[PDB]
Amino acid sequence: TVARDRLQIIIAQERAQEGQTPDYLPTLRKELMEVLSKYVNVSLDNIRISQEKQDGMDVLELNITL
Amino acid sequence: TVARDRLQIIIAQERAQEGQTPDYLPTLRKELMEVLSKYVNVSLDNIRISQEKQDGMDVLELNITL
């Protein structure tokens, strides 16, 4: 099923302005943690989230497994 | 600024059950087209969206530029 399937979502902000603040990730965080969870019925324990900034790119990696 | 920055979001469903129907993408579609657009103030003309299924993986690629 879709729930049993693997859902991977990666968000990259390339050349990120440090003078400004991403006002879109906070929403995506809810979108990936809360919203998608209800669709696949997978716990935040079974969901891996890793936000990491390399070079000038901020990468947010989602791995939802079941 | 964050708006001027490049936002790339890729959604992959690996080993996709064809007997079932993704009931999470429809929401993500609104999340990437409508919701994020308001945060970066970028038009759907300046946003590239490509959904393509290869092997058993359905990939949805987002490129928001400005």
Measure A12 CA to nearest chain B CA, in Å. 5
Q: How far apart are alpha carbons B64 and A34 in whole angstroms?
A: 24
Which residues in chain A are closer than 8 Å to B15, comparing Cβ atoms?
A: 5-6
Name the amino acid, one letter, at B25: L
Residue identified by tokens 């049993």 is A4
Domain extents for chain A?
2-64
Q: Cα separation of B6 and B59, whole Å? A: 19
The CATH fold of domain A2-64: Cell Cycle; Chain A (3.30.1070)
User: Is the minimum CB–CB distance between A59 and chain B shorter than 8 Å?
Assistant: no
φ and ψ at B17, to 5 degrees?
-65, 115
Which class for A60: exposed (0-12), middle (13-18), buried (19 or more C-beta within 10 A)?
A: buried
Is there a contact between A10 and B10 if contact means CB atoms under 8 Å apart?
A: yes
Q: Check B17 against A35: CB less than 8 A apart.
A: no
Question: How were these coordinates obtained?
Answer: NMR
Residues paired with B62 in a beta bridge: B9, B49
